[PDB]
Design a protein around this ligand. Structure first.
Ligand SMILES: Cc1cn([C@H]2C[C@H](OP(=O)(O)O)[C@@H](COP(=O)(O)O)O2)c(=O)[nH]c1=O
Ligand SMILES: [Ca+2]
Length: 129
């Protein structure tokens, strides 16, 4: 896998963000995670978290996996990095997202994320409290 550049357009919620990628606006959905919707428990906290992380970054990167790059809604599917830190992993580590939507071929960082979830659970963080 390799990192490519992108720039923030707008924070949307815990696991979606609008970025400019190869000069075009698109909504990215984060691979391998599920945050609660804004209207659910911890939804506002997950939104705040992603928002701070992407709005504070000097450098946003996108990393596609080996399979599907867009979903059926035309959302990009990627791992997203903020100054070299993976948003997907960080949400899970804090108990603000669950590992989810694991499909064959788009799962390079599965084990990394499950390891983070185990540690958030152990600490009873947020969703796990
Ligand atoms: C994360 C991810 C979601 N999706 C689709 C499956 C779900 O279909 P349905 O809309 O039919 O439930 C939807 C969940 O995204 P959200 O959690 O953003 O709603 O997005 C993929 O197809 N591939 C993926 O890698
Ligand atoms: Ca969601």
């Amino acid at each position: 896998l390799h990192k490519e550049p992108a720039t923030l357009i707008k924070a949307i919620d815990g696991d979606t963000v609008k970025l400019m990628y190869k000069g075009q606006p698109m909504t990215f959905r984060l691979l391998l995670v599920d945050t609660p919707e804004f209207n659910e428990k911890y939804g506002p906290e997950a939104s705040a978290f992603t928002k701070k992380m992407v709005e504070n970054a000097k450098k946003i990167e996108v990393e596609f996996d080996k399979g599907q790059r867009t979903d059926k809604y035309g959302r990009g599917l990627a791992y997203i990095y903020a100054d070299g830190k993976m948003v997907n992993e960080a949400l899970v580590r804090q108990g603000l997202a669950k590992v989810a939507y694991v499909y064959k071929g788009d799962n390079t960082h599965e084990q990394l994320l499950r390891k983070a979830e185990a540690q958030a659970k152990k600490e009873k963080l947020n969703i796990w409290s």
